[PDB]
Amino acid sequence: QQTLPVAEVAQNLPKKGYSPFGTKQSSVAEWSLARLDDLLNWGRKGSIWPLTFGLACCAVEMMHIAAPRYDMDRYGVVFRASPRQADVIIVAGTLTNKMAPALRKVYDQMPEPRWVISMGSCANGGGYYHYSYSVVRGCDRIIPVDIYVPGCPPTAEALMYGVLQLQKKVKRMKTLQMWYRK
Amino acid sequence: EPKDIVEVPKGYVYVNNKELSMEFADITDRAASTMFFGELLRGFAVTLAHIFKEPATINYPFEKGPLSPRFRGEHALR
Amino acid sequence: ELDGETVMRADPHIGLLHRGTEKLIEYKTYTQALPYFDRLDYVSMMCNEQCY
Amino acid sequence: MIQLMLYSLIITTSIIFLNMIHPLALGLTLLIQTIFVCLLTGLMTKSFWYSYILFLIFLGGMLVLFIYVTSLASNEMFNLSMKLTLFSSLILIFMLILSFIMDKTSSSLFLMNNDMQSIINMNSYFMENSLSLNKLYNFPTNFITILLMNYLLITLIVIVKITKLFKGPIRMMS
Amino acid sequence: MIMILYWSLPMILFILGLFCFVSNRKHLLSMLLSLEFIVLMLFFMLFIYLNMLNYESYFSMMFLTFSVCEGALGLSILVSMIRTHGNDYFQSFSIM
Amino acid sequence: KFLGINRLTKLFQMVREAGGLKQAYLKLYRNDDLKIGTLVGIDKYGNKYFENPYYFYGRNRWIEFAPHV
Amino acid sequence: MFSIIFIALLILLITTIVMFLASILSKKALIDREKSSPFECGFDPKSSSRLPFSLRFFLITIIFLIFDVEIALILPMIIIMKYSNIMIWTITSIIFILILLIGLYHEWNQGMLNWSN
Amino acid sequence: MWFEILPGAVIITTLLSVPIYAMYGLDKLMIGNAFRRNMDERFSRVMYQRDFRLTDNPYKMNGLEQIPDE
Amino acid sequence: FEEREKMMEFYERVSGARMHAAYIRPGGVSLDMPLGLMDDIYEFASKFAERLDEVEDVLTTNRIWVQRTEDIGIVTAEEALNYGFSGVMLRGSGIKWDLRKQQP
Amino acid sequence: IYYLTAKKVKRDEIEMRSAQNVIFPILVAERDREFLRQLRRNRDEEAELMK
Amino acid sequence: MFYMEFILSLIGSLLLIICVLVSVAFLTLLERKVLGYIQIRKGPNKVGLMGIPQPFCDAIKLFTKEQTYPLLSNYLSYYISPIFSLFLSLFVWMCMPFFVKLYSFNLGGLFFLCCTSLGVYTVMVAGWSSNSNYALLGGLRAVAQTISYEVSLALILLSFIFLIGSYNMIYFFFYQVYMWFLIILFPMALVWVSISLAETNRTPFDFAEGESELVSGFNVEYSSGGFALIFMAEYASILFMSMLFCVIFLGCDVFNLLFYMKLTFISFVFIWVRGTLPRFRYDKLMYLAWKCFLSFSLNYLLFFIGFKILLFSLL
Ligand SMILES: COC1=C(OC)C(=O)C(C/C=C(\C)CC/C=C(\C)CC/C=C(\C)CC/C=C(\C)CC/C=C(/C)CC/C=C(\C)CC/C=C(\C)CC/C=C(\C)CC/C=C(\C)CCC=C(C)C)=C(C)C1=O
Ligand SMILES: CCCCCCCCCCCCCCCCCC(=O)OC[C@H](COP(=O)([O-])OCC[N+](C)(C)C)OC(=O)CCCCCCCCCCCCCCCCC
Ligand SMILES: CCCCCCCCCCCCCCCCCC(=O)OC[C@H](COP(=O)(O)OCCN)OC(=O)CCCCCCCCCCCCCCCCC
Ligand SMILES: CCCCCCCCCC(=O)OC[C@H](COP(=O)(O)OCCC(C)C)OC(=O)CCCCCCC
Ligand code: SF4
């Protein structure tokens, strides 16, 4: 555990910059691949397209980032009906026994790269229906999850916190530098 | 005024209960609104008016929505 | 079941959001069974709390 | 050079059209056939009107025929063959070589274009599709146009009579 | 030679279209498409004849109209097959 | 001038208060809206809290974050 | 028209280079068994889309074809007005449009412009 | 508020104004005439044949200096 | 949904959760309403009539909405009674039945 | 207003047609002189080639 | 023909293609900004400076996501159809009336009708070849849509042509030197706006790509480049019919910036109709374009035939 720095210490530190991979990497090819990766992650963290999925009550909150108080289209985020035209599936609601192959098929038909936001307590770990017969204990055991939005109804502030943390995860996602070091 | 098909009781409201007027003035009014798109132009006018409104968006995370002191969030042990 | 664009036989399949709610209400206290009814009906909630 | 290329493409697409079992292969082959036939017809006339008219006709016709493809013989197997691809490629390269080594004055069409007509022709200086389409609406042959209006009305009456709309929709095993 | 260098080609393509029209195909709609192809090549040959003459190309739309009404007759016959049969197989129709 | 030229004057006042054209460009790049308001507070970690009641409720009080991030 | 052929071939070439550049720069992941399957709203299809489709507007399509070749005879008379007899041109034009109105209103009266159902 | 729509519209207004006005420069660089000769009518095409017969540049004009003194 | 988010803000003000309030309990309510909720609810209810007037000006009079809604899905009243309908689907078919008035 | 506009367009078209009619005789005179010269050249070349 | 021409025709056509493509990208930005402002919410503001490089975010992502290799499809016909859709949607833009001689299209209306008929051919080929039920339903809805609006689009065009007397769209400029044709043709300003939305598959006539009736229409199996070229083909069609609304109904001048301001305004109108009116059914579309639009087109064609005979005797 570390805390946020004091303003004198914060004035001592320099600016972080946009690039999470640093300014220089002591090679021309490494710098070129890092800047290409920065451009690619800027194009990917800008306008992730979530999927019209909406299993349950947490979905009603999902329209409160559609609703003009929070405005998910300001961030590039915009809903698409088909899973082929989507980067993100927001698994939000109760995942039951009949929806296990449905969610697995919709996730598998969605093309790479794939990031899944788990919104709500039922999608995280079953929640208030954890000890029931029909509810799958979270959506981790069927599909991978990158972001766990924790509130049962999350505030749309807390859902866009998960969306912005997904954007920061895509911003730190590195593939071309990995290709150079593989 | 258009007539009523079924007489309403006290304390009840009937929707889609008015008979369409068969006089020439109302038929010409609905005909002009048909071929000249009167309600379409009214809806376009309302929409163009709400283009000029102020947005209700808040600049997250610099601007955060209103809350209450009773708000339920992360559990904590005092 | 469609002949063209028009329907011939529309059969709804449900239970896709079946959570075993009533069997779970059988295992809780009435105060604990009260937040179930917020999750029966999704977009009217204080009505369901009023009914319970 | 372009006319001989259109000759070679029309020959190759006609060989392809004679060999296709599947209706959609015939539809795409006659799409590119009517494209090449529309360009070739244009070369012969002073103006480019009837190529455009024939293209609206043959795009208004096969638009309906695809609906009958999806209603009747929707499920039929495509079979690509290497022999047809090799034959079409060899004949196409052979006719492009033969068209390149040919004298193009002898192989050109003798039909007169808008610039092949002489300067002394005062009828060539008018608007380009006026005197060609004039006789549709002139006195000796307006009655043939009258006959065509009545013929199209009788055609529509025939279509309504022998496609009974009240018997229901059409499909396989109706 | 003159008949060979000019307009010998659409006779060959019309013969190929006629052989496509009468070939043993499973469906009637392939024969309708072969009819559309022989309309195209008859349009080519009629267009060569009407473009030797100067201002007689107005007839080239009338042939289009009679050919489209032929195609509409064939399409309505294809509808009327469904009123009696369940299919458009040429083997399914009566040989006598 | 009844069409909003005083709002252009307020925009120029916003530009001069931001610290220059380059500083206003940097503030408009970091914070997606350019706004004016009275400085209420400065939290230990270096963030600044502004409040202006002229705006819509929800945009009255905002935070400008620390310049080192 | 020779320039239109060359620029149409250039547009086709440019679009094929654009699609091949989209295919080359695409992410190359391994093909899963159920990734390639048709969507069908997340479940098994029960039927292929090559199953025969019911046509409820066959009469409307053939009337569309007949009316389109009727369109092919209207398009000349823009040019023909300045170069012909005015009397014959008006008799042909008003008689053409009135015969089309008789045919369209007669099939509206029969209800043949309504879909079979 | 509503003025932010105008960024993103003027770019559609400017860039679609590009392929006309640029040719109004790009003809003047090499043709010398900002309007290249139209070929809608047959007479304009025949007189274009006459200009391209007289000079290799059809947009170079033969004035009265061509005419000999007599 | 701008107004709907205002009402979930009201829900968060009275109970502490935006949607699932857990507020109405057996034996009354859990908590008293906070001070100043009257002015907020009153201002919202004053503006909501004009918001509904704008929404009805867009949706109700339009020919496309009428052609997409009218004479579509007609349910008879004896089918409504025999199939156990309740609420608006009873009230839309001419049956005068509201549970807030008959059994209050 | 369209009738007035059609009057203006007809005036411009009639002026262009008058310019065409006054330019054409010089062009057709040059055409027939070059046509007779090329016919003489073609008759000489056919006699030279087919000897 | 002079050599320099061919070079300048090639250069102007390529510059027009590039500018129409970048204007398609900024048209997506314009729709995503004002269509938000149709409602209360804002457009894209965070990415880039003020949302200006947001179509670059949308284009970098779609050119890098994984290409779908679908199972039951005919892939050799599935790969080629968006290429031909973008090819005809950019090939129709050669019909643009330039005051310089870009191309001497004497038959521009027939060229427009040919490319209009061919774009829906690419749509219905892409719908069939995906081998999905929603894709086939969107394709058949597109075929029913074009069978609905095609003859109505042609006859309405003829009425405008009668006011011109020629098929060359630059002759629209000489007949609009005193006033625009919006004064005369206001009922077909409404009717041509109705047809132009059915041409571009846009709301209220959005049956080829439905988000609630179907699932994305015929675009259900297209992803990461096929969807991109389909989407640019649709939006270039939107730009082309916005241009044709500015040519016929408004001033046909191209040396004024007011023409491109009007084209941006008609594109804003195209976004504006989508953000207000609900979608039809294509049953009601077929009952509209066959019994109302076609009858009104024939009747007002009779009105223009009589008016052109009346005008010709006075001249
Ligand atoms: C009550 O019950 C219910 C539930 O239970 C509770 C539910 O849960 C649900 C489910 C609902 C939810 C889960 C949430 C609710 C859903 C919504 C609110 C969705 C509705 C909102 C929308 C549809 C958004 C509004 C629409 C808009 C803004 C239209 C635009 C949208 C887009 C996606 C367009 C963006 C796409 C783009 C831009 C494609 C990208 C392509 C490009 C950018 C290409 C362009 C290229 C260039 C510009 C450059 C290229 C240049 C080139 C190639 C040449 C250059 C060459 C050079 C040399 C320079 C429902 C319905 C329900 O009822
Ligand atoms: C700055 C510009 C702002 C405005 C921009 C937008 C412009 C307006 C909207 C453009 C189009 C919007 C999208 C498409 C909407 C389509 C709506 C539609 O058609 O709905 C179907 C509806 C259907 O009508 P309905 O809604 O009445 O339906 C009941 C009737 N049945 C069922 C029988 C059809 O409307 C119409 O079809 C109306 C007619 C449209 C065509 C106009 C005909 C005019 C006829 C000539 C008038 C002559 C007057 C008298 C002259 C006398 C001379 C002596
Ligand atoms: C008007 C009607 C006209 C009709 C006729 C039109 C004819 C057009 C020409 C047709 C030519 C056909 C050639 C087909 C070759 C490929 C055949 C094929 O099917 O390939 C399959 C392959 C992967 O697909 P698969 O794994 O089979 O998945 C399907 C499973 N259901 O598929 C693929 O990999 C997709 C294709 C990728 C192609 C990449 C080519 C290599 C790169 C070329 C250079 C690009 C340069 C870019 C940058 C340039 C910069 C200047
Ligand atoms: C791949 C082809 C897709 C289909 C294109 C259809 C074009 C319209 C139909 C037609 O015949 O138009 C005649 C027109 C005739 O030209 P225009 O009369 O339009 O213009 C005169 C021409 C330089 C004065 C304007 O030709 C074309 O459109 C060329 C088509 C090129 C096709 C290239 C590939 C073979
Ligand atoms: S996590 Fe809470 S709000 Fe979300 S679906 Fe489950 S019970 Fe409903």
Numbering used by the authors:
A (entry chain S7): 40 to 221
B (entry chain S8): 32 to 109
C (entry chain S2): 105 to 156
D (entry chain 6): 1 to 174
E (entry chain 4L): 1 to 96
F (entry chain AN): 3 to 71
G (entry chain 3): 1 to 117
H (entry chain A1): 1 to 70
Task: Quote the original article.
Respiratory complex I is a proton-pumping oxidoreductase key to bioenergetic metabolism. CI couples the transfer of electrons from NADH to CoQ to the pumping of four H+ across the IMM. It has an ‘L’ shaped structure consisting of two arms: a peripheral arm (PA) that extends into the matrix and a membrane arm (MA) that is embedded in the IMM. Our Dm-CI structure contained the 14 core subunits as well as 29 accessory subunits, for a total composition of 43 subunits, two fewer than the 45 total subunits observed in mammals.
We identify a helix-locked state in which an N-terminal α-helix on the NDUFS4 subunit wedges between the peripheral and membrane arms. The name helix-locked state refers to the fact that the positions of the PA and MA are ‘locked’ relative to each other due to the presence of the NDUFS4 helix. Once the PA and MA are positioned such that they are far enough apart to accommodate the NDUFS4 helix, the binding of the helix ‘locks’ their relative positions. In the helix-locked state, the interaction between NDUFA5 and NDUFA10 is mediated in part by the N-terminus of NDUFS4 which binds along the surface of NDUFA10; and D34S4 forms a salt bridge with R92A5. In the helix-locked state, the C-terminal loop of NDUFA9 binds atop the TMH1-2ND3 loop, trapping R50ND3 to the surface of ND1, thereby holding the loop in place like a latch. In the helix-locked state, multiple hydrogen bonding and salt bridging interactions were seen between the TMH1-2ND3 loop and ND1. First, in the helix-locked state, the angle between the PA and MA is not consistent with either the open states of Y. lipolytica or mammalian CIs but the active site loops are fully ordered and buried by the NDUFA9 latch. This state also lacks the TMH3ND6 π-bulge indicating that the water wire of the hydrophilic access is intact, though a higher resolution structure is needed to confirm this. The presence of the NDUFA9 latch holding the TMH1-2ND3 loop down in the helix-locked state may block conformational changes in TMH1-2ND3, suggesting that it is a resting state incapable of turnover.
